[model samples]
Target: AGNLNKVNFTSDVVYQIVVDRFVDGNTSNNPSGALFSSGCTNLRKYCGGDWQGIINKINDGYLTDMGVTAIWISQPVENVFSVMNDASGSASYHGYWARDFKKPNPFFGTLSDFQRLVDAAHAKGIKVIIDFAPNHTSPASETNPSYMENGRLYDNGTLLGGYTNDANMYFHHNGGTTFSSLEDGIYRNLFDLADLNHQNPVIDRYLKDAVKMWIDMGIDGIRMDAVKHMPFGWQKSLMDEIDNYRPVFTFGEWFLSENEVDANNHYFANESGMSLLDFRFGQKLRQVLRNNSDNWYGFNQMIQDTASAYDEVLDQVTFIDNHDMDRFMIDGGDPRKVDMALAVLLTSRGVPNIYYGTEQYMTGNGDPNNRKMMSSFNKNTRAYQVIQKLSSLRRNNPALAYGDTEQRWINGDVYVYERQFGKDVVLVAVNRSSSSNYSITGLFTALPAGTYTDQLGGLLDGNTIQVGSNGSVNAFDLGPGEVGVWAYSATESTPIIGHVGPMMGQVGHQVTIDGEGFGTNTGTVKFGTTAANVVSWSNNQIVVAVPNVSPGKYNITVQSSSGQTSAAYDNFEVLTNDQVSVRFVVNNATTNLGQNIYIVGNVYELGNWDTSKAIGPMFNQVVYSYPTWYIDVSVPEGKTIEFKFIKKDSQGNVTWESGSNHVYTTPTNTTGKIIVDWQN
Candidate 1:
C-alpha cells in the first residue's frame, strides 16, 4: 500500500479507537486460556479487536457516516507475549509493551491486514494514525528476570537484550520514577516498564528503522506515546529523519495537569517539529462541562491562553477524555452535558478527537474502568448527532478549520464565540444551565450581514437570528443547555494561506499549501525571503518544493499572479540535510551556567561549520548526562563530514575545541553515529 496524499489535519474529526476494546472481526487471532477475556470481563486482558474489525466498520459506514475523517488506533507493534500478575494477570492488550518494533502484533493481525485497513480507511477519505511508544518496553523487575519477559526486546526473532542482563546498556538502570521531577521522570523507568536508553546507538537506530517501515506502509500520521518523557534532541532528530524520508503529520502525548501551564510543553509543540495533545483545553473543558469546577470564564481563559501559548495551537489535538482518564460521561450525570461538551469540542478551535464509545455515553474512571468494549454504534444519540453535524461543518467550512476565534458574548451560563477566516465565518453559542435561559444581547460577529439559521436545526435547542450592520446579531433568548451554530463560507478575492502540510521539511521536498483565491495561475510562493518553485497551483491549493534556505522556521506567504500577497502561515520549518539520522556524541565537553555544546560541521547539514548556525546546545540529560552531551542530526547519506563541537553561552560567546576537526562518514543507506572526546 502507498501513502495517502499529504493533507492538513486542521479540518478533520478524529476518532480514537482502542483496538482490543473495539469490535473484533477475527476470533481466530484471539489469545487462548488466561490471555483471552470473553465478553471483556477483565478489561486488562485481550479482547481480540483487530484491523479486520476496523475495516468492517469503515465499509459499513459507522465512521464515514458519523463524519470521522481520521482514526487513531492503538500501537500495532509486536508486544510481549508474557502476561503480568498485576491486575490479576494483565495481558499486553493496550499494545504498549513491545517485544519487537519491526514485527506486527499477531493478536492484532498480520501486516497485510493493516495494509488493508489503511486502504479501506483512505478509500473512505479517512486518515489513519497509529500510537507508538519508543520510551519503554514491557514491565520488568531487574532483580526478578522472570517478571513478564524481563522487558526483553527482539529484532524480529533476534534477541537484542533484556532489562536484567543488559550488558549492552540497552535499558536505563535508573530506578522507577515518582514523577516528582522532570529529571527523575526522564532518567528513570515509568513504573516497572523498562525504559529504553535512546542514547545507545543501537536502540536509536532500531527505533528510526521501525518507524520508517511503518511510514512506508502508508500511515498518515503517528501518535507518539510519552514524548514528554523522551529527550527533545532525539525526538527532533527522529522528526527530521521522517521529514526527509516522507513527512507525515506527527503529534505527541504530553500529559498536563489541570490548570497547569508548562514552558517545556510549549517549546516541544512549537519548536520540536511536532504538535501536542491539548490537555490544557481538554482539562478545562472537562471542568466546565462535566466536573463543575469552573465556568465559562475559565474555559474562555484557557482558550485564549493556549492560543497565545502555542505557536500553532490549531495543530494541537483536543479531546475530552481518552484511555488514561475518566470518561467524560458519568453514570447518573445529565447526558445533555455530554452533548454540550461534544458541541463545544467540535465547533471550537483545534482538531477534535472523540474517544471510542463517547458518543454512546461510555462512563468509567481510569485505566481498565475507562477502557471498555464500545457499548453501541447508535448514530442517533444526541452526542453522536452533535458530532455528526459539526464534523461535517469542519470539512466544508474554512472558518471552522483555519479561523481566528473571537468571543462575541459570555456569562457564567452562556458563551457565544465567532470564528473568522477571510470571508468565511462561524458563530457558535452554547448555554450551560439547564434551568436558566439567557438573553443573548450585543452579540457581534464577523459573519456577513444576513439572516442566519441554526446549522444544528434546533438539535440542541438552537434558534435562528437576523443580523444588522457591522456583524451585529439581533437580541435573542438562548434556551437552557442550548447550542447554536451559524456559518458563512464564501470565495475569497485575495489569496489566503490556511494551512501547510508536513509543516517541516528539507529543501526540494514538496509541501501542500491549502487555502483560497490563488487565481488558477501559477503564483509566487516564498519561504521567508526565499522564493519556492511551484510544482502545481490552483485557486485553493498549491504544491511547491521548499526553497533552500537556512534550516529554521520561516513564515510562508503566497503572492497571486496578480501580486496580491496572502497572510503568512507562520512556523513552516525548513530542515537541514536528509537521508539518515546521525548521532553525534562528545565526552568531557563540560559547560558553565547558561552555556551549552553545539555541533558544527563541513556539511550544510551541520551549519557549514558556522559557530552562529550550529545544530544545538546539545542535550545533557535524559539519555546521557553532563560533560558528555549528545545529539541526533540528520545528514546526507554516504557523505564523509568533518565536524567540531563548541561551547556557546547566553551572551553569544563561543569556545571551540582546540584541535583538528573530527571526521566521520555517514552510512550510505542507514542511520549511524559517532562518539569522541572533546579535542583539546
Candidate 2:
C-alpha cells in the first residue's frame, strides 16, 4: 500500500469516529453473543464502520468539505468479548476493552479492513491516528495464551503490585491507588483487568514492538490511554524506544488540569518526545467561552503560563469537547456560546481538535451519551459550514496552525488576541457576556481602518470602528453572545497592525501610531511601522523604524486590541530583532523567598533560541542581555538556590558568563507534599 502522506494539517480540523455507532459495514459479522444480550438490545452493536465505510466517506469528500486533515478513530485492535452494561444496562458498543493487540476487533472488521481504511485515508490526504491502551488488558479468558501465567497474576489480582520481588512483573508501587478500598497498602488490579507490568523488560519489549508494528502498518500517530496511571519512567522508556523506530507522533491521555502539578508532571515526564491532550485548557475553554463568563482571564493567563512551561505549545492538542466531556451545544450550555469557544480553540496556541458531531450540535452528558455515533451531516446543524470554513482557513494559514499568541486587550466580558507567524496574522475576539454589550480597545493602531467583513457575520460597518492613530477600536453593537473573526490582508486597503514594542518604556521616547481599519481589513505590514499610544488621533504621529526583514520574521503583529479591528488606514509596523535582553546584578546577593533586591541595568539583548535546534547544555551559549542590567530576582517559595547571569552576543554566542552568586534564602517548612488523589 502507498503511504498516506497527503493529509497536511496545520490548523486543520478533525472529526472523531466511534466505530460501533458510526456506520455499519459487513453486517453479517455482528457478534451473536452481543445480539442476544439484553445490554445490546437497542445499541448499534457492530454497526460496521469498516475501512471501506471510511473510504466511502473520503471518496464522497465529506472530510474534504469539512477541511478535515485527520481522523481520530477508536481503538482498532481486537476488542474484548466482554461488554460493559452501562447505567441503562447496555452492552458497550464503544470499544474500550481490548482482546488482542495483533488482531482487529471482529465486530468492527478484519485486519485487512483496517489496512484498507488506513490506505484509503492516506489516499484522501488524511492522516490516521489510532488509540492505544497501555495501562491494562482484558482477562486471560478473553484471549488465547491469556495475559496471566500459571496461578500468579500481574499486579497480584490487585490494581497495585503485590511485592517488589518480581522484576518480570509489577513491583515497587510508589504511586497511590485510585480506589479508596485499594489504598491500604494493597493493589487491587483494575477491574479484574490484566495490568501489564511495563517495568518488566519482556513486557516493555513487547509493547515497543507493538508500537513499531502499528507504525509499520502506516499509522501516523498513537494516543496512549490512561497515561497518569502508569509509571513515568516506563512511559519515558517506551517513548524513547519508539522514537528510535520512526517519526511517530505520540500523545498521552493525561486527563489532568491545565494549571495543576499533575498536568505539569505529565509534560515533564513526556518531555519533548511526545505531546499531550490539553485537558486543563479544554476545561477552561468550556467554562469561560461556553459559559460566557469573565473567567476567561484565568484561561488566558493559563495559556501564557503554559507556553513558558513547555518546549513547544503547538504539540499540545486544544479542543472544546471530546469523547469524554459534555457536549458543547446542548449539555446545559448555551449553543450560541460555542462560537466563542470555537474562536478560542482555533485561534489560540495549540493543535485544535473537535469531537465528531460537534458542528452538528451533538449533545450528551456522559459515557454512552458522549460516545454516540455521528448522524448524517446537515446544513441546519449549528455552525457546520462555519466550522468547515474555519478549518480551511487554519489549514491555509500558518499562523493558525503553529504561531505565537499575543493578547491584544482584555476586560471583564470581552477578550482579544492575535496569532501570527511571519506576516500571516489572525485576530480573534469574543464577547463573553450572556446579556450585555461591551466595547473594548485595539492593541495596534496600524491595523486596517474601515468597514470590513466579519467571517462569522456579513460585512457590517461600524461594528468595528478605528480610533485613528490612537490604536484603539470599538465594538459598537454586539449581541449578548456574539463572537467575531475578521481577517485582514496587508495587500488590502485596510490593514491591521499589532503593537509589538516593549511594554515598559520611557514616556516621550516611545514610538506610537494612529490609523483605522487595523486587523480585519489587512494582513500584511511594512517594516518599521509605528502607531501612537495616545488617546488623541490628531496629535498622535506614531514613528517607527522599518528594518530589513527576512521572508519569515518573528515579531508581534496586532490584529485586535479589545474586541474589534479597524477598516480604513489601520496598518503599520514596529520592527525589532528577535533578541530580547534582561539584565540582573547581584545586590547583596542573598536568596530570601519573596525578597525584592534591586540592581539597575538595561536589557541589551534577549535570548530567543531557535526551538527547532536540539536543546542541551548549550546554556553556555544562547543568552541575550543588556550592558547595564538591573532587576530584582526573587527566590521561589521553597527554593534557595544561588543564581548567576550568562550574556550572549547577537549571534547567540556567549560572550560573558557570570559565576553563581549565592543568595541566602529563608527556608520554608511544610507538612508534606500535597498529592492529587482521584479515582479513574
Candidate 3:
C-alpha cells in the first residue's frame, strides 16, 4: 500500500468484454449440450467465453498489441442458474441476475480461474476492474436461486421481527408508484431486478463486504451498476471504505440522459465522487456523426459543456456505443463514421471504454442485439486497426495520456484538437465524412516551432507539418474517417536562450553564451542595457563574449534578427552566494489521467488552498509509482510552512483531496527533499 501512492487510473485503455461471449479458451469448462457454444447461436445464451479465454488474450498479445492497459470484464459473481423467461425470454447468460454474491459463476469459471485471470492481467500491467451490481438482486421467482430462499436474500443475517416487515432487509410491496425509467424508480422493482433495500444498514454492510471481497481477490477498480437506484450515500460509503483500505478506483453507472450532458455528470461524478459513463457525449457524437452534420461546433460544444460541468473528473468513461444502445453501425451510420467516432473516443478527454465486439465491427441493435457474442479475433479489421493505433498512442505518449486539450479547428468535414503537456504536444485531427477529403490549415500553432509527423501509421505520412514561430500549423489534410495523431520531431528551434556564463561568471569578463534560435543573425545582445558583441552566431548556436559592462544581476537578453525573442528568465542566477534548493515531493494515488499535481496549503508559497495558483508543477520531474511527483523550488532556508497536494486535470478542473494540513519547515540542510504523502 505504501507504494500504491501515484497512479494514472485514466491512462488505462480498457477493453470491456462479456464473460460469456468473448472466447472459449477452455472447452473443458463448457457444459455438455450448452445452448450456445463458441460456434454461437442465440446471443442470450452462454456462448462459451470465460476467464481462461481472457487469460488467453494476455498470452496471445492480442490485448498487448492493441495497447489495452485494463480489462473491465463482465460481472463474474454467481447469478441465477436457470433462465427466467421474461419479455426477452432470454436465459441468465448476461450475469446481471445475481443469485449468489459469494461465488464466481461456475459457467464462467471457478474462483481459482477468476483469480488466475486477474493475476495474469496484472502480470501484463493491466488492471482488471470488475462490474459490480449493488442496487438489486435476482428476481423473487422459483427459477432464480435466491428467490427460493426468504427475504429476497440467499441467507439473511439480522435481528428482524419477521421477513417482509423487517427494517433494512426487505423490498417494497407491489412496486413503486413512479417509474418512467429504472433509475428514477427510487425504490421501485427493477422489473426482474428486485431492488434491494439499501436504506437498511445490514444490506448496505453486506453489499460493501461483497465488493471488498472482490477487491481482496485482486480486482483493481470497480464500475458499480444501477447506482441511481440506490441512495448516493451508499455509493460514497462503499468508495470511502475501499479507498481507505487498498484505494480501489471506482465509478458508478450513472448514465446520462439523451444529449444535454445531464445532471448525472454533476451529481454522481462531481458531488458523489463516483465517476460515471458519460452517455451525454456518446449521444451527441452518435447523432452528429449519424446525421453527418456541418456543425462540428455542435459536437465540440457538448465537450465544452462537459468541461463546464464535470471538468477534470469528466474523464468519466467515454464510449460511442455500449451494450445498452444500438450499435453505431446499425443506425444511419456506416463503418467509416464508426471509425471516425471511435477515434474521437480514444482522442477525447475521457477514459475510452471499448465494448467487446466493437473492435471487430460486430453489429447489433438493442437488448439481445447489443449483447452480441464475440467470435474469433479479427486483427485485420478496420476498427481493430484504428483501436490498435490509437491505443498505442494513448499508452506511449504523455500528451495523449494526460495532456490539456484545446479544440483548434472544427468545420463540417473535419475537427482538430491539440493535446499538450509541458513541451509534449500532439494534434488529433479527424475527418467527419467517409467519401471526401478533409483539409485544414493553421490548426495547431501552440506547438512551439518544430516539425511533427503523424505517429498514427504509414499511409498518412510525408509532408513534415511545421508549427510557425507565431504558434500555429501550416496544413493538415485527411481522407474520409482518417485521424492524424501528429507528434513531435526536432526542427527549427523555438528560440531558447540558455545559461549565460560558466555556471557562475564574473562581471566584465567575456563569458561564453549558449543558446538556440539565434536565427542567422543575433539582434542586440544586452546585459542590464549595455550591449554585448556577438562573438559568433548560427541558426542553431550563438555566442556572446562577456559584455564590456557591469552586471550585478540582470536577464541575459537575446532577440533574434527575425524578432523571435527568448522568453525564459528563470534560469539566470547572477553568481549569488545564498540561493537554496528546496525540493518538494508529493505522493498521490488517483486521477493521474489528464491531471497535473502540485502542492497547496495555507501560505502564499503554497497557493493558500487556491489550487489555481498552487505551488510549482515544477517539471524538475521525479516519478516512481503512478504519481509520486516532485518539484524543486529555490526558496531561502529557515521558514515554517504548511501545504497539501492538489490536482488540475486536463480541462482545468481542480481536485482538492479531503485531508489534514501537511506541516513542514525549511531545514538547515541546503539540499533536501520534503516528501509528503497526499490524501485526496
The lDDT leader among the candidates is 1
- Candidate of highest TM-score: 1
Candidate 3 structure, TM-score to reference: 0.67
lDDT of 3 by residue, 1-680 (tens): 11121123555677888877777878777754434434565677777878998999888988877778888987887775554444333556777876566678777898899999988887777888888887776665423334423324553232222234435445544454255643345446666456675545456556767877788897877788876676453455454446434555577776565645445447567544356787877777877776444257877777777767773442478888776787777644467666677777887777788888777777877777787667557777777787888787775555665566688887766778887644556777777666788567656556767777666564333235777768867765677766666764234455654333221233333344444566776576766666777776776445555454432345666677767667543222232122234557766545566677777766433455777767544332212344576654433336666777777777778776677777777643244458877775
Deviating ranges (above 4 Å) for candidate 1 = 1-5, 579-680
lDDT (CA) per prediction: 0.87, 0.51, 0.63
Candidate 2, residues 266-313, lDDT tens digits: the string is 444234245778876887776676644437688778778777765556
* Candidates 1 and 2 compared by TM-score, better number: 1
The global Cα lDDT (0 to 1) of model 2 is: 0.51
Model 2 earns a TM-score of 0.64
Deviating ranges (above 4 Å) for candidate 2: 1-9, 35-48, 84-92, 139-176, 179-188, 257-266, 269-272, 291-294, 331-333, 442-451, 457-475, 488-680
| Total clashes for model 1 | 0
Q: Which regions of candidate 3 fall more than 4 Å away from where they truly are?
A: 1-7, 31-39, 87-89, 141-152, 155-168, 174-184, 291-294, 331-333, 436-439, 458-464, 489-680
Higher TM-score: candidate 2 or 3? 3
